[PDB]
């Protein structure tokens with residue numbers, strides 16, 4: 001009831017914050033000038049880095065750079081999802097009373113935090129970004145969560161807010177927030193079916209909502225928890241490792257530093273390919289002392305990922321199946337997640353839906369935060 005509440009999207013790879021400032025929702029850019037900040041936290045001898053600064057030093061400090069906390073939040077150390085994921089994280093995950101705790105080293109001192117504490121740090125960064133832009137203290141907010149999150153996961157998220165000093169007015173589902181973003185919540189005096197296609201950094205979520213009277217009903221969901229942007233980056237990486245080996249006769253595969261730098265260059269090239277037909281990869285002193293100057297073409301990129309792009313439609317086909325609906329019954333198709341900006345993914349979706357127009361006027365990566373910001377405003381007054 002003082003200072004507008006903010007809408008915060010807390011994603012597994014990137015987070016975003018927006019505020020309904022008098023009439024419109026303005027999505028707040030950070031200190032580095034980005035509209036989304038990695039959900040990365042890093043611990044060094046002299047400091048605690050959050051956001052871009054953390055992600056930008058990962059290759060150097062892998063064991064003390066935390067990410068993927070959302071895959072742990074509200075879970076028990078003993079569950080199979082945790083057990084499986086742990087086998088691919090550079091950081092340490094320990095067990096405390098059946099609860100996972102990320103073990104790290106901060107200033108020589110060994111520490112460990114609960115997933116909700118890692119997330120609250122990301123939340124503090126968003127709140128900072130907001131307060132910076134507005135020139136006032138931000139207390140109230142609406143935080144989003146996946147539709148499949150159970151009661152434990154939802155509480156852990158609320159707690160993350162409380163720790164960060166936030167008054168969580170409400171916790172809403174991500175697909176619902178995307179729908180509100182486009183005003184699909186307005187009462188049209190009829191039942192409406194909407195398909196949210198969310199392809200972000202590490203997960204793929206497909207949801208079919210049914211809206212009537214402004215009341216949402218998640219009729220079905222599908223997707224893959226280990227399918228996202230990073231999978232595309234990795235295919236390019238494997239492609240360049242082989243080319244470097246060809247041109248230089250030496251395999252850099254096992255150099256954890258070279259690989260992470262290449263990977264960083266690839267993800268940057270991938271972003272460019274969404275708007276251009278080719279991009280250049282210039283990495284000084286890639287392996288030992290050799291500079292890796294080269295380029296990729298959009299055509300080659302799609303080719304390296306063809307199988308992954310097509311597979312994307314199976315979960316969709318299944319979503320329809322479970323909701324007992326046919327393609328023709330979908331009123332609106334909303335694109336969400338930074339990966340839906342890839343031209344070939346959009347094509348594949350339209351083709352499947354026989355030309356239907358996709359909702360994509362709001363950056364797909366900012367859609368969830370956009371919806372949460374509208375929601376927050378209405379739950380306030382101004």
Ligand SMILES: Nc1ncnc2c1ncn2[C@@H]1O[C@H](COP(=O)(O)OP(=O)(O)O)[C@@H](O)[C@H]1O
Pocket residue numbers: 010011012013014015036199200201202203228229230267270271272274336337338339340341342364365
């Ligand atoms: N222009 C772009 N083209 C392709 N991928 C992009 C683009 N912009 C962002 N991305 C990707 O979006 C992913 C992040 O998606 P986002 O929806 O912001 O993440 P999250 O799944 O964490 O919510 C990353 O893989 C990033 O590379």
Ligand SMILES: [Mg+2]
Pocket residue numbers: 011012174198200337368
């Ligand atoms: Mg997301």
